[PDB]
UniProtKB/Swiss-Prot annotation:
It is an enzyme of class 3 (hydrolase). This is Ribonuclease HI. It is found in: Cytoplasm. Mn(2+) 1 binds at residues 9, 49, 73. Residues 3-133 are annotated as: As active as intact RNase H. Nuclease that specifically degrades the RNA of RNA-DNA hybrids; seems to act exonucleolytically on RNA/DNA hybrids. Endonucleolytically removes RNA primers from the Okazaki fragments of lagging strand synthesis on its own. Complements the temperature-sensitive phenotype of an E.coli double rnhA/rnhB (RNase H) disruption mutant. The keyword DNA-binding applies. It catalyses: Endonucleolytic cleavage to 5'-phosphomonoester. Its main location: cytoplasm. Its EC number is 3.1.26.4. It comes from Halobacterium salinarum (strain ATCC 700922 / JCM 11081 / NRC-1) (Halobacterium halobium). Its cofactor is Mn(2+); Mg(2+); Co(2+); Ni(2+). GO terms for molecular function: DNA binding; exonuclease activity; metal ion binding; RNA binding; RNA-DNA hybrid ribonuclease activity.
Length: 133
């Protein structure tokens, strides 16, 4: 039940290097129902941006929302998730199947690109977690 706006952001210091995720669940009246930031060990930028998506989707599914609007600032995640792009990388293929599995739990979904400054919350959660690694 209900709609959520789920922001996500990855942070990584190498290819791969220490990485973290951040995510924010917002309602329509604009309350932050839940948010998170965590270190994830070593990962690339693109892995972290994907892991933050999955962490946002898991949190929204835990909260039982039925309609999710994803908001992030990674082109690569958006274009792969929507099927515009495909990748040979078997690890990012697996993260997409995982994200799509999660998405199947919602009655509706969408994804929208926001500039990073608009995504400042999730970005601060991921970076503050990574700055403490
Ligand atoms: Mn980002
Ligand atoms: Mn960021």
């Amino acid at each position: 039940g209900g709609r959520v706006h789920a922001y996500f952001d990855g942070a990584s210091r190498g290819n791969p290097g220490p990485a973290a995720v951040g995510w924010v669940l917002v309602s329509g009246d604009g309350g932050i129902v839940a948010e998170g930031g965590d270190t994830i060990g070593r990962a690339t930028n693109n892995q972290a941006e994907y892991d933050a998506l999955i962490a946002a989707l898991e949190a929204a599914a835990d909260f039982g929302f039925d309609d999710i609007e994803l908001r992030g600032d990674s082109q690569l995640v958006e274009k792969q998730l929507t099927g515009a792009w495909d990748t040979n990388d078997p690890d990012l293929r697996r993260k997409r199947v995982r994200a799509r599995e999660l998405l199947t739990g919602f009655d509706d979904w969408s994804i929208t690109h926001v500039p990073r400054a608009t995504n400042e919350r999730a970005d601060a959660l991921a970076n503050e977690a990574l700055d403490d690694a």
